[PDB]
């Protein structure tokens, strides 16, 4: 009856918002391209507070964190490439032959032995030097004259070889007065009201692994194998499936490579591919045919929940596009693999040893956003072999169903890890009536 | 006892959450947010630092122009206009949560913030007129 306004400072109420999210990382110390040394050390006690009775609305497809990580990663690469060697003198006419012929017909042109004139430390004196280049990095002229793949579109820079491409777990954190909300629902769709909710000062460790088709080294579901898309009934919206069991994939570039330093100027050094010690073999990836068949069936079972227990779905290989999107392209040991994937999506399923993936290698990779910039990955010495799990996929429907892979948008990778998070802002001020009066 | 943690009583009743206000009060400025390098992570952190102190003082400023400086629970002289919410006390403090309460009182939140502002400008004018003897 006698009710006055009563002010409360520190009430558990929040609203959705967008904010700058800073990074955290664990102590490990060279320097990676992700600059995780320049982040605040993560707490050895990642405090997670459970929000009893709370139910929040989530929407991983309007989430702002993925739009910020997609830009942070790109800013991390541009920052790390700035002080490295510009390779504009390499955009010069190349005299190329095949390296060590007589193996398997049109697989000796897969990599070339190329010699060219080049600037020295003295601006007036030239040098004829030779290097090995993969076929995916050169084009003809129309004689045995070639040129770098990028010289008509982009300028080129080689990554400083002291920088590591190895992904390091990154923790995104909300500033003081903000919050991260986790959806602890073990069968969460990515959108809609989530029953179990917890708040965290920082997200879990997220390795910024940029892969195609197959999601690598990612986080796993705890039950079933979820499938996430905004409009699944729309064939133009990518399907982000996520396994609960990790299907292991082994990759290797078996050629024992040599890095030969070349002085292209005062203090400027281009790292050419010298020669190959031992056999000239084929880069490839293995994945257990048993586990892949099992895990490919789990996706079929959950794909039925959106298309019917009676319908038939089929897996086919990519339908074209740029090379990065038609193949399982990723980074392994510093070299950029581009793996033909037809041996993984060549299967039709009824209503009710290992397989090997032939991979080619590129060195002059282009930026995925703008045009006019491309990086030269320096050649890695020794033998390369990386071992990782496939934890998800990026599929595409066509409208008997058929599903094929793809997905050249980097933020689809971050969606697969930031789906369970949401950024809100604390509003600790609250007014409410009670029979209390000042003085 | 209980100690639900930071925002732990977000789903609790308004009266129960009104007993754990220091939990959310101390976490409005600390967190984890020593040189200032202007890198992609450095400019990021510097913004996260300045934004936190800004929003903290905006609340403390309103808490000041209402006579509630350094209070978690202050009472005022502004009476409750029933057009804000005709709900009874026992169906608010033992029923609703602070989230849904802010959802329905959000319209008149700017009206209430003005009534408290002049009630404090007039209370301190009366306190001066009383100590003038």
């Amino acid at each position, epitope marked *: 009856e006698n009710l006055w306004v009563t002010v409360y400072y520190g009430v558990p109420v929040w609203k959705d918002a967008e904010t700058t999210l800073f990074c955290a990382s664990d102590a490990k110390a060279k320097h990676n391209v992700w600059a995780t040394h320049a982040c605040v050390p993560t707490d050895p006690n990642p405090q997670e507070i459970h929000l009893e*009775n709370v*139910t929040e609305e989530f929407n991983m497809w309007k989430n702002n964190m993925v739009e910020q990580m997609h830009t942070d990663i790109i800013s991390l690469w541009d920052q790390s490439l700035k002080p490295c060697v510009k390779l504009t003198p390499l955009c010069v006419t190349l005299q190329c032959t095949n390296v060590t012929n007589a193996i398997t017909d049109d697989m000796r042109g897969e990599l070339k032995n190329c010699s060219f004139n080049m600037t020295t430390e003295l601006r007036d004196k030239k040098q004829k030097v030779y290097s090995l280049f993969y076929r995916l990095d050169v084009v003809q002229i129309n004689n045995k004259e070639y040129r770098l793949i990028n010289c008509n579109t982009s300028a080129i820079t080689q990554a400083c070889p002291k920088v590591s491409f190895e992904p390091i777990p990154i923790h995104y954190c909300a500033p003081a007065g903000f919050a991260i909300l986790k959806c602890k629902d073990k069968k969460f769709n990515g959108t809609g009201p*989530c*029953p179990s909710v917890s708040t965290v000062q920082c997200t879990h460790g997220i390795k910024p692994v940029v892969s195609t088709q197959l999601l690598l080294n990612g986080s796993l579901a705890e039950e079933e194998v979820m499938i996430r898309s905004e409009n699944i009934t729309n064939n133009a919206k990518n399907i982000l499936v996520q396994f609960n069991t990790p299907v292991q994939i082994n990759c290797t570039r078996p050629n024992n490579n040599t890095r030969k330093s070349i002085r292209i100027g005062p203090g400027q050094a281009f790292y050419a591919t010298g020669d190959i010690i031992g056999d000239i073999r084929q880069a490839h990836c293995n994945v257990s045919k048993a586990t892949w068949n099992e895990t490919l069936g789990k996706v079929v079972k959950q794909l039925r929940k959106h298309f019917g227990n009676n319908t038939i779905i089929r897996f086919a290989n990519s339908s074209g596009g740029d090379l990065e999107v038609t193949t399982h392209s990723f980074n392994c040991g510093g070299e950029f693999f581009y793996c033909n994937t037809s041996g993984l999506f060549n299967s039709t399923w009824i209503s009710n040893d290992s397989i090997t993936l032939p991979c080619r290698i590129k060195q002059i990779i282009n930026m995925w956003q703008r045009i006019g910039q491309a990086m030269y990955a320096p050649p890695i010495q020794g033998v390369i072999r990386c071992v990782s799990n496939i934890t998800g996929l990026i599929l595409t429907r066509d409208g008997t169903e058929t599903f094929r892979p793809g997905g050249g948008d980097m933020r689809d990778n971050w969606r697969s890890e930031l789906y369970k998070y949401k950024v809100v802002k604390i509003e600790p001020l609250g007014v409410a009536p009670t029979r209390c009066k000042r003085r | 006892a209980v100690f639900l943690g930071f925002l732990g009583a977000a789903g609790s*009743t308004m009266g129960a959450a009104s007993m754990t206000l220091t939990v959310q009060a101390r976490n409005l400025l600390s967190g984890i947010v020593h040189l200032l390098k202007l890198t992609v992570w450095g400019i990021k952190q510097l913004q996260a630092r300045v934004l936190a102190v800004e929003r903290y003082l905006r609340d403390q400023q309103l808490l000041g122009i209402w006579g509630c400086s350094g209070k978690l629970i202050c009472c005022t002289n502004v009476p409750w206009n029933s057009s804000w919410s005709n709900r009874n006390l*026992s*169906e608010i403090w033992d*029923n609703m949560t602070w*989230l*849904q309460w802010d959802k329905e009182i959000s319209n008149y939140t700017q009206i209430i913030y003005g009534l408290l502002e002049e009630s404090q400008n007039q209370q301190e004018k009366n306190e001066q007129d009383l100590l003038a003897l």
Partner: nanobody
Amino acid sequence: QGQLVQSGATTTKPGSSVKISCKTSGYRFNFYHINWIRQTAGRGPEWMGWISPYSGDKNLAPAFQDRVNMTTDTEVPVTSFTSTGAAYMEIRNLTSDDTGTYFCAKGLLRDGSSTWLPYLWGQGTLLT
């Protein structure tokens, strides 16, 4: 708001055991108890008992102590404050003297001295 749709009004004969359903909407099913009330024709209205859709803790009158099974399943979130739930009612050593209209009613408040009080009722169901 709040709605509590009840089951059908079908009838059986003594010795049996029937199940009464109560489906809720427009409110958080877990935040209030679920009561079962009986309006017999040859007796004053009787409170049978309430149950917690959150804590699972049930409490019945000693007249129904070992003759009634009360169960509720978990809710389905619709919005941040709206869910859908269900409550079930059973009788064991049943006769024809337990005839009347049966209601389901949710609790009043979430805390205090009148937490479980039957505040929002269903349309009732006719029995044998």
